[PDB]
Enzyme design. Structure first.
Site, PDB file in Angstrom:
ATOM      1  N   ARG A  29     -16.613  -4.591   7.888  1.00  0.00           N
ATOM      2  CA  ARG A  29     -16.394  -3.881   6.616  1.00  0.00           C
ATOM      3  C   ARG A  29     -17.409  -4.367   5.581  1.00  0.00           C
ATOM      4  NH1 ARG A  29     -10.651  -4.466   6.663  1.00  0.00           N
ATOM      5  NH2 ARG A  29     -11.087  -6.657   7.139  1.00  0.00           N
TER       6      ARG A  29
ATOM      7  N   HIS B 250      -2.994  -8.221  -3.688  1.00  0.00           N
ATOM      8  CA  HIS B 250      -3.436  -7.221  -2.689  1.00  0.00           C
ATOM      9  C   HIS B 250      -4.164  -7.912  -1.550  1.00  0.00           C
ATOM     10  CE1 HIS B 250      -4.197  -3.361  -1.053  1.00  0.00           C
ATOM     11  NE2 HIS B 250      -5.495  -3.598  -0.985  1.00  0.00           N
TER      12      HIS B 250
ATOM     13  N   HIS C  80      -1.283   4.336  -0.738  1.00  0.00           N
ATOM     14  CA  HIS C  80      -2.484   5.092  -0.331  1.00  0.00           C
ATOM     15  C   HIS C  80      -2.430   6.610  -0.537  1.00  0.00           C
ATOM     16  CE1 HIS C  80      -5.928   2.981   0.948  1.00  0.00           C
ATOM     17  NE2 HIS C  80      -5.282   2.125   1.743  1.00  0.00           N
TER      18      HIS C  80
ATOM     19  N   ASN D 296      -8.257  -2.964  -3.292  1.00  0.00           N
ATOM     20  CA  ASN D 296      -9.532  -3.131  -2.585  1.00  0.00           C
ATOM     21  C   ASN D 296     -10.277  -1.806  -2.472  1.00  0.00           C
ATOM     22  OD1 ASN D 296      -7.578  -2.520  -0.168  1.00  0.00           O
ATOM     23  ND2 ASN D 296      -9.652  -2.434   0.713  1.00  0.00           N
ATOM     24  N   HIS D 297      -9.561  -0.694  -2.442  1.00  0.00           N
ATOM     25  CA  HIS D 297     -10.190   0.628  -2.282  1.00  0.00           C
ATOM     26  C   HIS D 297     -10.721   1.217  -3.585  1.00  0.00           C
ATOM     27  CE1 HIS D 297      -7.909   0.281   1.440  1.00  0.00           C
ATOM     28  NE2 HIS D 297      -8.672   1.241   1.933  1.00  0.00           N
TER      29      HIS D 297
ATOM     30  N   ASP E 119      -3.227   0.119  -3.404  1.00  0.00           N
ATOM     31  CA  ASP E 119      -3.926   1.095  -2.555  1.00  0.00           C
ATOM     32  C   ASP E 119      -3.182   2.396  -2.762  1.00  0.00           C
ATOM     33  OD1 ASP E 119      -6.182  -0.117  -1.379  1.00  0.00           O
ATOM     34  OD2 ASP E 119      -5.027  -0.890   0.306  1.00  0.00           O
TER      35      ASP E 119
ATOM     36  N   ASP F  62      -7.519   6.497  -1.665  1.00  0.00           N
ATOM     37  CA  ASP F  62      -8.437   6.952  -0.602  1.00  0.00           C
ATOM     38  C   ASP F  62      -7.764   7.646   0.588  1.00  0.00           C
ATOM     39  OD1 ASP F  62      -9.678   5.269  -2.379  1.00  0.00           O
ATOM     40  OD2 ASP F  62     -10.972   4.346  -0.856  1.00  0.00           O
ATOM     41  N   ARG F  63      -6.525   7.314   0.940  1.00  0.00           N
ATOM     42  CA  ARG F  63      -5.976   7.752   2.248  1.00  0.00           C
ATOM     43  C   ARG F  63      -4.892   8.835   2.184  1.00  0.00           C
ATOM     44  NH1 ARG F  63      -8.729   3.249   4.459  1.00  0.00           N
ATOM     45  NH2 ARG F  63     -10.664   4.056   3.537  1.00  0.00           N
TER      46      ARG F  63
ATOM     47  N   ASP G 166       0.821  -1.223   0.000  1.00  0.00           N
ATOM     48  CA  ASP G 166       0.000   0.000   0.000  1.00  0.00           C
ATOM     49  C   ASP G 166       0.848   1.263   0.000  1.00  0.00           C
ATOM     50  OD1 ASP G 166      -1.839  -1.909   0.220  1.00  0.00           O
ATOM     51  OD2 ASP G 166      -2.939  -1.017   1.901  1.00  0.00           O
TER      52      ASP G 166
ATOM     53  N   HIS H  81      -3.318  -5.862   2.187  1.00  0.00           N
ATOM     54  CA  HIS H  81      -4.657  -5.326   2.492  1.00  0.00           C
ATOM     55  C   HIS H  81      -4.661  -4.291   3.621  1.00  0.00           C
ATOM     56  CE1 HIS H  81      -8.748  -4.602   2.927  1.00  0.00           C
ATOM     57  NE2 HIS H  81      -9.081  -5.602   3.726  1.00  0.00           N
TER      58      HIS H  81
HETATM   59 FE   LIG Z   1      -4.536  -2.876   1.212  1.00  0.00          FE
HETATM   60 ZN   LIG Z   2      -6.628  -2.039   1.580  1.00  0.00          ZN
END
Ligand SMILES: [Fe+3]
Ligand SMILES: [Zn+2]
Lengths: 43, 385, 300, 575
Positions: C205, C158, C50, C108-109, C76, C79-80, C48, C232
């Site tokens: 989740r 992932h 992100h 996954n995001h 990833d 999103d972050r 990740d 993940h």
């Molecule tokens: Fe992840």
């Molecule tokens: Zn993730």
């Protein structure tokens, strides 16, 4: 003594977990106040 | 005794919750914070009226933790009148915004100079409009944001306060205190960090702080245990080596919540300090710490009911207090929309009804006249003497 | 090949944390459009990122510059972080510029409807202001590999295992081009996570499936694999082992959420196929220094 | 057309700051074309930070285009509107603008409008007004009538006595240069009283500003009288309650010493300096420690040595052992700087133990700062007395888990190599250079490679050929492809310094071997390597070896290899 305070330990935990869903997550002041009120395990 | 006269209500359900009330140092303009970012500002009619409104903050969604941070302006503070334009510090849960409220200075100028859309050239686009748009003269007050403070507070913000020397202002969150320069908003000096390395042992929450009004170096920050620590930046840069600690049979479960001090204010003279714990308003002379000079009870009948108020949410309510400009008297809120004035001269207390159920959490006192402002939840009251 | 040298200039532009124009990113994205992406033995695997663009610049500083260094990213990157769009553009830029030296894996995001329910549309509105940029950024998801089967020996993705997918041959039958609601193996294979308990499980989740040492042994011995590399969730110390060298998790975003103290890592795969995790700390970026116990110059 | 931009500034309304700014920032033609008469300047009054700043930036230039000596007073109400704004930077530019036009105002205009403008600004109860006036007095005083010269000091005293602390901050700030032109007897009789009030003000921000005023005042007044006139105020400032004032006295300490001369320094500043280094605040020790080098170099040579060993150096003993990271780092940056003063004997007695103590600090910044300034010690005693204790600190730094420390030390290796010399560096540190080449972090490999280039530059060709090149090429054999690629970057940067002969004959063959490397990364980095070193290669060898190998790569299965190989041949003009 009869049960007037056992409520409090459970409500101590019940308000800790009820905070995480609300807007802004934990308010550390109210969370610590809720966490410091408790009940002794045994007497 | 002061014969307070019932206030006129001028302002006024979730976004409109007055989270702070504050008069400017010369109390002509009154700014009230909110839980919806709308700092409703009023000013005293030149011998109060709705002056202006500005959206101090939006719902700033934190994308690193997904916390839906609210637009909760927990503090409103005025600056000194640098120029004709007044300034206001507004702080939401996460970030402070410095604002400028200026009148329309160019009202006459805008009327004195105007030409065609093409600067008096032919074939202008809006040919009629220019003939009328030239009359722009208006008396409205124009709000404007000046400087944006950074995201320094990793926790809900609870207090800010302008220092006696107008270069810096205090900011304190439930775990740390940062000193912000007014114009230099890119960095802050973390003056206090009580944070225990492991959150497991979190005993101390900094519930409120303020600067000493006449001394630029003295400031106090409350605590969850009630121990008001009066810090002095003269001693050292970092103020962990606090100069004094103020601290005081009934040791119920909730002794750890009644001892929490929701608010601390210095007297206008800075001779005395008044700290509001949940049950009592404690007034301390700054030279004696082992006890207050006077202890005041805000509500007698609520001392025994600490379970019932704890099943409910009420026992967490943040109450505040304020002094007379002469410091002779202090006033604080109580439940059921009642607030109490604790006269230190005659030791006579008079309770007052604003018009449990309703909480007068925040109130203010005009620093030059017996005018007090009250932050009811959905109402604002400015009582006269 | 003037457009190629222009993209070589976009490398410099993007490294300055400046977003490309909608026209530039579209010309790149159009030219960007498998589950078995046989990756040769020398490669660098990353977890990740992100959107921590400064931490991605740090990451390149640790691992190395591309095309010189090969890369394969478990996904990833949106999103972050403060620089979601600026990270995704650099990634797809590297891919289209070096199609055979850079690989990006579906994360996954990355979706359309849940990202709109989340803020990333708002992020793009702050950055650009319109729907077209977001749309162009989303269509590349369907064309992004689901897994990275590095070789017969090592497997990386992932996510982790799923109730329906035991054998690599099953990994082949998976379709990358699938945007469908959250139910089904399409979520399981991305959002999965391991635990020391041997058996199925569920979480608060969106739908995601967990697994233990038993499922890892079924997936490994039935395939001749040597790991199930994942990225993940957050792991402190940068890499988290599981199930006695049967599952491993990589996180490549040091100080994942600026509040957290977590380290980050990436695993270099040598010529002799061998995982080598590299440890690195968050970048020296001060940003807005609020902690600095060296009194700011305004107070001195 | 192009001429109406003078009036589009507010013809557009609900404007964009960029459009307003660009409409505003066009002064050359409009000042002579329209601004002579049409402005009579109320278009120049827009209230926003950037537009106000731009207005100030432009209004400062109207003097030469408008007929200044006659009308320049017309520029005052605009600059007044700009000076009274809340924005500090705007006020600063507005005052700089007013100060510029002051030199061109005739004494008649200076007296008629300019001085009354300063008076009106003091008269304007909005304290930003007063704040602005604080800096204007300094330029009008020299050329205005003696009556006005006296009247101005009354308002200036009022400024220094105003109950707005910011006003006193500004006044105290500008008092320094103001005293430079005031009559000497007027400085002594009129400024010193208000200066004493400033240096003893209730607000610490005010008191902390008086010390630069003290610096200028001391630079002006006869040194023989400072002991009575200013010094009683400096004593109480240097020992003030607030650490902020002590910090500023420590920071301005070099200026103070230069202003007050060495005899008064020996009598009053040195004990004060000891009291500053021993202060309970780490920041004050940081400031004082930073200036210890300059202060010592500024003392009179007769007292300097004995004063250091008797009063400062024993305090340095405590500073080297200080509890605070920042204090140790700050002193560490300068501490060697005492060596030119104490070089022969005293360095071995005290400074070497102080260095060796700092060279073992837990924080890397201390060790880095010591090694960053070794020049001061190497020129007096020589590196051999330090090398034996420098090698473990650099080795420990070069292995820190925090790779950024390894990077930070890598940056200093050429300075270190130049100091430690040819024998010691290749005896003890060359191995560490190789240790960084192989290092797992690319940032280290890259920085160390570029660093190694500088080492070859400092040492020349034959050294690197005899000892470095034989090792860097061995990284080609490493199964880790990243190390081979690092060999290519190393070969690349070396070709520039080692020249065509050594590159093509000894070094270059290694690049062709990995051209057929099984990893496409090594192949196209070979392409990029030849593309960079190619211009240095001989046309004969370029045609014999570079051309056919590059051509072979242009037909590879890998599009990246083919792309870069073609690009290389193109840049080399081979194909
Ligand atoms: Fe992840
Ligand atoms: Zn993730």
């Amino acid at each position: 003594f009869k049960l007037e305070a056992h409520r409090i330990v459970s409500i101590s935990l019940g308000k800790i977990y009820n905070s995480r869903v609300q807007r802004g997550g934990i308010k550390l002041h109210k969370n610590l106040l809720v966490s410091l009120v408790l009940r002794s395990a045994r007497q | 005794d002061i014969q307070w006269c019932f206030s006129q209500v001028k302002g006024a359900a979730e976004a409109d919750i007055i989270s702070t009330v504050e008069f400017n140092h010369s109390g002509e303009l009154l700014a009230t914070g909110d839980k919806g970012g709308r700092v409703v500002i009023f000013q005293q009619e030149q011998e109060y009226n709705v002056y202006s409104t500005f959206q101090s903050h939006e719902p700033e969604f934190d994308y690193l933790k997904s916390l839906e941070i609210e637009e909760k302006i927990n503090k409103i503070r005025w600056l000194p009148q640098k120029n004709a334009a007044q300034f206001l510090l507004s702080t939401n849960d996460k970030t402070i915004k410095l604002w400028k409220i200026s009148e329309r200075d160019k009202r006459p100028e805008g009327y004195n100079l105007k030409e065609e859309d093409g600067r008096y050239r032919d074939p202008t686009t809006v040919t009629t409009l220019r003939v009328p748009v030239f009359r722009p003269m208006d008396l409205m007050v124009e709000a404007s944001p000046r400087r944006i403070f950074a995201n320094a507070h990793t926790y809900h913000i609870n207090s800010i306060s302008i220092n006696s020397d107008y270069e810096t202002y205090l900011s304190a969150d439930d775990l740390r205190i940062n000193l912000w320069h007014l114009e230099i908003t890119d960095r802050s000096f973390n003056i206090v960090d009580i944070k225990p390395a492991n959150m497991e042992e979190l005993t101390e929450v900094i519930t409120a702080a303020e600067f000493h009004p006449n001394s630029c170096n003295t400031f106090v920050y409350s605590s969850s245990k009630g121990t008001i620590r009066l810090c002095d930046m003269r001693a050292s840069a970092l103020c962990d080596r606090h100069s004094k600690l103020f601290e005081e049979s009934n040791r119920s479960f909730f002794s750890e919540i009644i001892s929490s001090i929701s608010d601390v204010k210095f007297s206008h003279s800075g001779r005395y300090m008044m700290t509001r714990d949940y049950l009592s308003v404690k007034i301390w002379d700054l030279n004696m710490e082992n006890r207050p000079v006077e202890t005041y009870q805000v509500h007698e009948y609520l001392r025994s009911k600490l379970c019932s108020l704890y099943e409910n949410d009420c026992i967490f309510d943040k109450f505040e207090c304020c002094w007379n400009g002469s410091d002779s008297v202090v006033m604080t809120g109580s439940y059921n929309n009642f607030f109490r004035m604790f006269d230190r001269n005659t030791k006579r207390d008079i309770t007052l009804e604003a018009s449990f159920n309703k909480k007068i959490l925040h109130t203010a006192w005009h620093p030059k006249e017996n005018i007090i402002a009250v932050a009811t939840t959905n109402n604002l009251y400015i009582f006269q003497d | 090949k003037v457009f190629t040298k222009e993209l070589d200039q976009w490398i410099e532009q993007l490294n300055e944390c400046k977003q490309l124009s909608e026209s530039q990113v579209k010309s790149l994205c159009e030219k960007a459009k498998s589950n078995v992406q046989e990756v040769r033995c020398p490669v660098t695997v990353c977890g990740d990122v992100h959107g921590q663009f400064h931490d991605l610049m740090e990451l390149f500083r640790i691992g190395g510059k591309s095309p010189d260094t090969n890369y394969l990213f478990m996904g990833d990157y949106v999103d972050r972080g403060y620089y979601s769009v600026e990270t995704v553009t650099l990634l797809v830029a590297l891919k289209v510029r070096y199609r055979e030296r850079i690989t990006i894996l579906r994360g996954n995001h990355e979706s359309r409807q849940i990202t709109q329910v989340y803020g990333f549309y708002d992020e793009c509105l702050r950055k650009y202001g319109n729907a077209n940029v977001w749309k162009y950024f989303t269509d590349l998801f369907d064309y992004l590999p689901l897994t990275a089967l590095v070789d017969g020996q090592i497997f990386c993705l992932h996510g982790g295992l799923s109730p329906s997918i035991d054998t690599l041959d099953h990994i082949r039958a998976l379709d990358r081009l699938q945007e469908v609601p959250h139910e089904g193996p399409m979520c399981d294979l991305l959002w999965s996570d391991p635990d020391d308990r041997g058996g199925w499980g569920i979480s608060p989740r969106g739908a995601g499936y967990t697994f233990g040492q038993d499922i890892s042994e079924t997936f490994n011995h039935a395939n001749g694999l040597t790991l199930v590399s994942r990225a993940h969730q957050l792991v402190m110390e940068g890499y988290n082992w599981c199930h006695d060298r049967n599952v491993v998790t990589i996180f490549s975003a040091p100080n994942y959420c600026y509040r957290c103290g977590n380290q980050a890592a990436i695993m270099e795969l040598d010529d002799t196929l061998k995982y080598s995790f590299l440890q690195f700390d968050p970048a020296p970026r001060r940003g807005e220094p609020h902690v600095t116990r060296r009194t700011p110059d305004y107070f001195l | 057309s192009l001429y109406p931009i003078a009036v589009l500034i507010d013809e557009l309304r609900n404007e964009d700051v960029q459009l307003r700014l660009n409409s505003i920032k066009k002064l050359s033609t409009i000042a002579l074309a329209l601004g002579v008469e049409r402005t009579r300047l109320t278009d120049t009054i827009y209230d926003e930070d950037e537009v106000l700043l731009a207005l100030a930036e432009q209004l400062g230039t109207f003097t030469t285009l408008v007929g200044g000596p006659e009308y320049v007073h017309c520029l005052l109400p605009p600059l007044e509107s700009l000076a009274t704004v809340e924005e500090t930077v705007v006020r600063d530019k507005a005052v700089e603008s007013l100060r510029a036009i002051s030199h061109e105002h005739s004494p008649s205009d200076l007296e008629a409008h300019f001085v009354p403008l300063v008076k009106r600004l003091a008269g304007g109860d909005w304290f930003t007004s007063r704040t602005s006036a604080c800096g204007l007095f300094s330029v009008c005083y020299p050329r205005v009538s003696s009556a006005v010269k006296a009247e101005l000091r009354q308002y200036f005293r009022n400024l220094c006595s105003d109950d707005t602390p910011m006003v006193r901050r500004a006044a105290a700030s500008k008092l320094g240069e103001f005293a430079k032109v005031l009559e000497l007897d007027n400085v002594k009789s009129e400024i010193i009283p208000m200066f004493s009030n400033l240096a003893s003000d209730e607000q610490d921000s005010v008191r902390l500003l008086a010390v630069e005023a003290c610096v200028n005042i001391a630079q002006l007044l006869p040194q023989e009288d400072l002991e009575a006139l200013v010094m009683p105020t400096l004593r109480q400032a240097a020992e003030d309650k607030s650490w902020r004032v002590r910090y500023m006295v420590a920071d301005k300490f070099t200026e103070l010493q230069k202003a007050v001369g060495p005899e008064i320094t020996k009598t009053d500043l040195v004990p004060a300096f000891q009291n500053l280094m021993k202060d309970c605040e780490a920041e004050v020790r940081a400031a004082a420690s930073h200036k210890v080098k300059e202060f010592c170099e500024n003392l009179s040579a007769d007292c300097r040595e004995n004063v250091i060993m008797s009063q400062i150096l024993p305090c340095i003993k405590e500073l080297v052992s200080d509890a605070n990271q920042h204090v140790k780092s700050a002193l560490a940056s300068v501490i060697m700087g005492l060596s030119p003063i104490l070089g022969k004997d005293n360095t071995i007695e005290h400074l070497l133990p102080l260095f060796l103590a700092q060279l073992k600090d837990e924080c890397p910044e201390v060790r880095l700062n010591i090694i960053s300034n070794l020049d001061c010690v190497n020129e007096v005693i020589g590196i051999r007395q330090l090398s034996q204790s420098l090698l473990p600190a650099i080795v420990e730094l070069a292995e820190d888990a925090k790779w950024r420390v390894r990077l930070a030390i890598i940056e200093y290796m050429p300075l270190l190599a130049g100091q430690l010399g040819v024998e010691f560096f290749d005896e003890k540190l060359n191995s560490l250079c190789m240790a960084w080449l192989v290092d797992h972090v690319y940032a280290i490999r890259e920085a160390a490679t570029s660093n190694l280039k500088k080492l070859v530059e400092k040492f020349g060709k034959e050294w690197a050929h005899a000892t470095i090149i034989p090792k860097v090429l061995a990284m080609s054999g490493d199964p880790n492809y990243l190390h081979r690629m690092t060999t290519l970057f190393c070969i690349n940067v070396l070709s520039e310094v080692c020249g065509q002969d050594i590159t093509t004959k000894h070094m270059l063959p290694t690049v062709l071997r990995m051209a057929g490397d099984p990893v496409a990364n090594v192949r196209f980095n070979v392409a990029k390597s030849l593309q960079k070193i190619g211009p240095i290669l001989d046309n004969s060898t370029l045609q014999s070896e570079v051309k056919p190998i590059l051509e072979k790569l242009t037909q590879d299965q890998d599009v990246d290899v083919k792309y870069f190989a073609q690009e290389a041949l193109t840049v080399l003009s081979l194909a």
